[PDB]
Amino acid sequence: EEASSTGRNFNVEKINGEWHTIILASDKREKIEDNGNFRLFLEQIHVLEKSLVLKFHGSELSMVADKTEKAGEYSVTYDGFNTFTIPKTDYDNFLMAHLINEKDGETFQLMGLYGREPDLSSDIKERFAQLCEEHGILRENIIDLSNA
C-alpha cells in the first residue's frame, strides 16, 4: 500500500523510525552539492502528536517540523523557511519528500528519496526520477548519495 501525506488514508505513525538519505534533487543544484546546506543525511523521523523530529548528520543535526494548517504539510526553520509534504511513501521501503525553501526573498524546490535501508532498488530510484520530472527537476539535478 502507498500513500501521500496529503491523502485521506495517510498514516503518519507509519513513517516513524529509521530512514536514510538515498537521493536528493534540487532546481538549485548548489544547495545539495558538496558544500550545500541541504546535503543532509537523514537518520530517523520521530513522529510526535503535532510535529516530526528529523535527525540528520552533515556533525549531528536535529530539527522540529510542525504541522501547518493543511493536512500532510509541515514547516521547519532551517537555512530559511521550509514547508514540505510527502507525495509518496510505501512506509516499509521508501519515502519521497517535496520541500520548498524560502530564503532572502528567493525560493527553490528540494526533493528527497529516503530508504529504510541505506540503499533502494533501481526501480524505486527510477520512480523517484519520474516524480522529479513531474516537478520540473532535470535528472542532471538529481544526485544519488547512497555511495556517499
Ligand X SMILES: COc1nccnc1CC(C)C
Interface with ligand X includes 78 (CB under 6 A)?
yes
Neighbouring residues of 99: CB distance < 8 A, sequence distance ≥ 6: 82, 83, 84, 109, 110, 111, 112
Interface with ligand X includes 96 (CB under 6 A)?
no
CB of 44: closest distance to ligand X in angstroms?
10
Site residues for ligand X, window 43-72 (CB under 6 A)? 54
Give 57's DSSP letter: E
* Contact with ligand X (CB under 6 A) among 10, 84, 94, 108: 84
CB of 110: closest distance to ligand X in angstroms?
6
CB-count burial class (<10 Å; 0-12, 13-18, 19+) for 2: exposed
* Contact with ligand X (CB under 6 A) among 15, 40, 137, 142: 40
Q: 112 or 115: whose CB is closer to ligand X?
A: 112
Maximum alpha-carbon separation in the chain: 40
Stretch that binds ligand X, among 4-12, 76-84, 123-131, 140-148 (CB under 6 A): 76-84
CB of 18: closest distance to ligand X in angstroms?
13
Q: Rounded to 5 degrees, what are φ and ψ at 132?
A: -60, -45
CB of 4: closest distance to ligand X in angstroms?
14
Interface with ligand X includes 108 (CB under 6 A)?
no
Nearest of 75, 67, 62 to residue 49 by alpha carbon: 67
Neighbouring residues of 5: CB distance < 8 A, sequence distance ≥ 6: 12, 71, 72, 73, 85, 86, 87, 89
User: Residues in the site for ligand X, rule: CB under 6 A?
Assistant: 24, 38, 40, 42, 54, 76, 78, 82, 84, 97, 99, 112
